[PDB]
Amino acid sequence: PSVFLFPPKPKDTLMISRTPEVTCVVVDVSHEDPQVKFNWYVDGVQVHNAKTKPREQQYNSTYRVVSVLTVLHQNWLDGKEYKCKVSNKALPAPIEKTISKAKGQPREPQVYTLPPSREEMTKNQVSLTCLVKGFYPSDIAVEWESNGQPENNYKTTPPVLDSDGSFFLYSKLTVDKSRWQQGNVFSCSVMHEALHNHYTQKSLSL
Amino acid sequence: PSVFLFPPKPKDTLMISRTPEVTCVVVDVSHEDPQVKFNWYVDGVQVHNAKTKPREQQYNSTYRVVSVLTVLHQNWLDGKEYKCKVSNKALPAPIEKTISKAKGQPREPQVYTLPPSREEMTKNQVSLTCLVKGFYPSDIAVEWESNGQPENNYKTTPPVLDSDGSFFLYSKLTVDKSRWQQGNVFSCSVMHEALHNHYTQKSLSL
Amino acid sequence: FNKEQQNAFYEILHLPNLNEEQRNGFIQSLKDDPSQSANLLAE
Amino acid sequence: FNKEQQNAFYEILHLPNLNEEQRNGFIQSLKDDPSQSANLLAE
Ligand SMILES: *[C@@H]1O[C@H](CO[C@H]2O[C@H](C)[C@@H](O)[C@@H](O)[C@@H]2O)[C@@H](O[C@@H]2O[C@H](CO)[C@@H](O[C@@H]3O[C@H](CO[C@H]4O[C@H](CO)[C@@H](O)[C@H](O)[C@@H]4O[C@@H]4O[C@H](CO)[C@@H](O[C@@H]5O[C@H](CO)[C@H](O)[C@H](O)[C@H]5O)[C@H](O)[C@H]4NC(C)=O)[C@@H](O)[C@H](O[C@H]4O[C@H](CO)[C@@H](O)[C@H](O)[C@@H]4O[C@@H]4O[C@H](CO)[C@@H](O)[C@H](O)[C@H]4NC(C)=O)[C@@H]3O)[C@H](O)[C@H]2NC(C)=O)[C@H](O)[C@H]1NC(C)=O
Ligand SMILES: *[C@@H]1O[C@H](CO[C@H]2O[C@H](C)[C@@H](O)[C@@H](O)[C@@H]2O)[C@@H](O[C@@H]2O[C@H](CO)[C@@H](O[C@@H]3O[C@H](CO[C@H]4O[C@H](CO)[C@@H](O)[C@H](O)[C@@H]4O[C@@H]4O[C@H](CO)[C@@H](O[C@@H]5O[C@H](CO)[C@H](O)[C@H](O)[C@H]5O)[C@H](O)[C@H]4NC(C)=O)[C@@H](O)[C@H](O[C@H]4O[C@H](CO)[C@@H](O)[C@H](O)[C@@H]4O[C@@H]4O[C@H](CO)[C@@H](O)[C@H](O)[C@H]4NC(C)=O)[C@@H]3O)[C@H](O)[C@H]2NC(C)=O)[C@H](O)[C@H]1NC(C)=O
Fold first, then answer.
1. Cis ω on the peptide bond leading into residue B8 (within 30° of 0)?
2. The Cα angle at residue A107 between residues A83 and A4, in degrees rounded to 5
3. Which residues contact A152 (CB under 8 A, 6 or more apart)?
4. Is A16 in CB contact (< 8 Å) with chain C?
5. A10 touches A141 (CB < 8 A)
6. Which is nearest to D28 in space by CA: B135, B73, C7?
7. Do A166 and A74 share a structural domain?
8. Which segments carry the Immunoglobulin-binding region B repeats (chains C, D)?
């Protein structure tokens, strides 16, 4: 067996309207020994369930077992340790796994919105760019809107660490040349811990 | 044991001045059975050495063995199969591994250079952006220059697949606000298979 | 996102003197009744 | 990069009718003597 432990989605720890989950994905366990007692600790303390919810899957030639501990937004943002432990008897030792966030001291992102190049108006689809820089931790969420409503047509690059010791990203909205030329408002909406209400937005208009 | 097989660096298969290598990294092998006969095949044919060069390392609690097959630029660009095979006796079966490039039909990258935002001239370091889009395969190499000479101060994002079925990237040159304002020439120099001589360059100037 | 549920959430999260349980309470009642989401602050 | 070694390399690489060995030869002599790097084309 092998125990992976994933974080909550940054959007989901950021937004009180959302619900953050710490997912402990073990792939193996075996038959004759399926009896994997999940153990969930938060900072020091065991949480019993704390609404822990393992749902059994029957895969490969083996079992895929996952328990999802739901987290308080506050706690993870204040970085507690989310320690997953998997038991069994076919398993000589309790497989331990700790997550928490980054640990650094938050840095507020810089959101500048960049228009298409003139050489790109020779194309009849253009691209809209948002540069988000100098944030920390890497835990961010950018999205795009048209006029006031969701644009599904975007691609965001992974946060990559800059010379600064910060993170940066780009997000590229591809719109129609006409759709830009008609002076239509576009906007990139960035969500990170170190923003005004965990939320900000910056507009691109012709 | 486990046999990983890495590609040549795209720059190194692109530039005739460079030399492309296909690196077969196995981590294990064991003692009492170190006798890992590397087998190197190109398309169908075994290459003997073909200047194959395994150099022994003594790690962890186990051995880290690597053989580096040097490739003809032409062959890899014409996508032959670089098949690495690791033998032994502690190993019931010849561990086989095939690489080659993408396979698609090349698409030529679009290189537009983007100036800093006005809101960013309120900072006294600005950022220079090159958007490289709509290429295929993902095998590309971007670099930056100042006036005519290398800038070491850049960060390139990983190629990420766009809606198109193409790849795109951004590369961010951070320069001094003054260094930009003095109308100094900057330039992003992109290298990909589907470019004029595997090479192109696009300039940012105030 | 939507509401001042989060605007309220933010504040109560960044309350310097709103000690632990004092905070946790306010944030949780604030998940439970967004309506009441406006009810913030002790210290 | 530097030279027309590569400019020459490019061409000989993209020669439509420069069949296999006919190409491989030209490209390799072109690694061996960049000087001669200008020597390109059969068909
Ligand atoms: C028997 O079969 C099973 C299943 O096989 C499939 O295929 C068969 C052909 C078929 O017949 C079926 O059996 C079946 O369809 C095999 O299982 C696989 O086992 C391997 C390991 O052997 C696993 O690989 C690991 O994957 C990790 C990443 O996992 C994510 O991505 C994969 C790929 O998409 C997904 O499959 C997987 O489910 C994970 O997705 C993420 O899941 C979480 C939880 O659901 C999501 O959570 C969100 O949570 C929030 C909460 O608010 C919210 O609710 C969201 O909605 C949720 O979605 C999250 O979003 C998902 N992510 C995305 C993008 O959607 C790898 O990280 C891991 O790699 C690390 O470890 C290995 C081992 O040590 C290292 O070699 C590797 O380098 C790396 O190490 C270090 O890890 C660090 C952390 O990543 C990293 O930072 C560090 O840099 C790195 N170090 C280095 C040096 O690089 C590994 O690759 C597979 O995931 C698993 N497959 C499945 C489907 O579960 C089984 O092996 C097989 N048995 C055999 C062969 O014997
Ligand atoms: C005993 O110890 C050793 C060593 O341990 C160190 O640490 C100890 C604490 C210490 O005491 C010492 O022992 C020692 O310091 C352990 O070895 C490690 O073993 C693991 C596996 O168990 C390996 O992990 C894999 O790594 C792959 C990536 O490898 C590159 O990155 C790592 C991290 O930087 C490097 O370490 C490594 O050397 C590789 O670098 C690249 O190397 C090549 C060749 O040199 C470079 O080539 C260039 O070539 C051109 C030619 O022209 C030119 O010459 C250039 O100059 C050259 O540089 C290349 O540039 C390097 N790259 C860079 C960026 O520089 C991972 O890909 C691999 O993960 C895949 O497989 C696992 C297993 O199945 C999956 O779980 C995982 O998901 C992933 O699967 C799939 O892979 C696809 C391909 O990547 C991917 O596309 C796909 O998405 C993915 N699928 C999914 C679902 O995600 C894996 O993580 C370590 O590399 C190795 N460490 C070392 C130092 O070698 C040993 O295990 C241990 N024994 C034990 C614990 O029992």
1. no
2. 25
3. none
4. yes
5. yes
6. B73
7. no
8. 1-43
Pocket test for ligand 1, best of A13, A25, A53 (most atoms within 8 A of CB): A25
Q: CA of B107: how far to CAs of A117, A172, B103, B136, in Å?
A: 20, 19, 11, 5
Do A15 and A43 lie in one domain? The reply is yes
* Cα A5 to ligand 1 centroid, rounded to whole Å: 10
Which method was used?
Answer: X-ray
Q: In one letter, which amino acid is A135?
A: F
- Two tokens, residue D36: 């001669």
CA–CA separation, A30 and A64 (whole Å): 9
- Residue A153 belongs to domain spanning: 101-206
Rounded CA gap, B169 and B156, in Å? 7
Cα(C7)–Cα(B200) distance, integer angstroms: 49
Q: ∠B86-B87-B89 over CA atoms, to 5°?
A: 140
CATH of the domain at B151: 2.60.40.10
Question: Do the chains contact at A162 and B172, CB–CB below 8 Å?
Answer: yes
Domain count, chain A: 2
Task: Please list the residues that pair with A144 across neighbouring strands.
Answer: A188
Considering only the beta carbons, identify the residue of D1, D7, D24 that sits closest to B74: D24
Structural domain ending residue among the three candidates A72, A100, A128: A100
Q: Which residues contact B121 (CB under 8 A, 6 or more apart)?
A: B177, B181
| Domain limit, last residue, from A50, A74, A100 | A100
We report the CATH number of the domain holding residue D24 as 1.20.5.420
On whether both B127 and B95 belong to a single domain, the answer is: no
Q: What is the DSSP letter of B136?
A: B
Total number of domains in chain D: 1
Range of the domain at D6: 1-43
Residue B112 host element (H or E): strand B110-114
Give the SS3 label for residue B188. Answer: strand
Token pair in block for residue A159: 């946060």
Q: Cβ distance D5 to D38 under 8 Å? A: no
